[PDB]
Amino acid sequence: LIIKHQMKLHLNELVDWAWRNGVTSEKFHSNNGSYVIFDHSAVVETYIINKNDLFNVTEEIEITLDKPIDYFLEKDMYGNYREHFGIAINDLLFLNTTVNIWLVNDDNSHILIYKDGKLIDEYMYHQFEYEANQNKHIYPNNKASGTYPHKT
Amino acid sequence: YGSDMYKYIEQVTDTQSQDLGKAIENAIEQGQTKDRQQDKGHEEYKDYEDTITKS
């Protein structure tokens, strides 16, 4: 169960993500045409990069029982709701009692991943990911934060 | 030969153990209470005071 996740990151977030998920050599372009070049997992050359510049990066999050999940919500068969941070699903002491497990997406939106004793397949997960936060209005805000740097 | 021989020379018994326990207890309690109070009051009184004045 591997899920593509495309996001836009500032320079600090992009550098952090690149160093955590090792990149040997790659050039990342930004919203405003600035670029940063990683060579041998070390920053080498950066163009004129202003604040609020957005870089597009796609990361794969894979949801499996054995690997840890950053934030999930578990419902016992008795009716108790608990939340667990950064532990695998199998790491629960008594997985026998657990009925449902929902991933949490930092938007306070729950996506069902574990029901009826088995993981949710990829396509039902896509359906639930669309379905969880339908009426999510994002604030519209645009600032150019740049101008053609050279004298032309 | 070697050092291990000493272990046999003086009877040595190595003992290990490991106990791993798990326990989940779930208790559900429900309670209902019904009360009913009914009171009655009744009081009656009488007074008499006679004042006689001279001036």
Please, are residues A79 and A69 in contact by the beta-carbon 8 Å criterion? no
Chain B residues with CB inside 8 Å of A76's CB? 26
- Can you name the residues that pair with A68 across neighbouring β-strands? A88
Alpha helices in chain B, H assignment, sequence order: 5-9
Chain A residues with CB inside 8 Å of B24's CB? 93-94, 97
* Beta strands A55-62; A2-9: pairing state: antiparallel
In one-letter notation, the amino acid at residue A73 is: L
How far is the CA of A58 from the CAs of A35, A61, A86, in angstroms?
A: 16, 10, 21
Alpha helices in chain A, H assignment, sequence order: 11-20, 122-132
**Chains A–B, number of C-beta pairs less than 8 Å apart:** 10
Chain A residues with CB inside 8 Å of B26's CB? 76, 78, 80, 97
Angstrom distance (rounded) from CA A39 to CA A26: 7
**Cβ contacts of A121 within 8 Å, gap of 6 or more:** A1
CB atoms within 10 A of CB A47: 15
What is the resolution in angstroms? Answer: 3.6
Angstrom distance (rounded) from CA A36 to CA A14: 10
**Contacts by A131-138, CB closer than 8 A, 24 or more apart:** A132/A105, A133/A105, A133/A107, A133/A109, A136/A107, A136/A109
Per the CB < 8 Å rule, is A97 touching B22? Answer: no
- Can you name the residues that pair with A104 across neighbouring β-strands? A110
Per the CB < 8 Å rule, is B22 touching A93? Answer: yes
**Cβ contacts of A75 within 8 Å, gap of 6 or more:** A81, A98, A99, A100, A101
Tokens read off for A65: 């029982």
Look at residues A59, A39, A43 and name the one whose alpha carbon lies nearest to residue A11. Answer: A43
Please, are residues A100 and A114 in contact by the beta-carbon 8 Å criterion? yes
> Which structural technique was applied?
cryo-EM
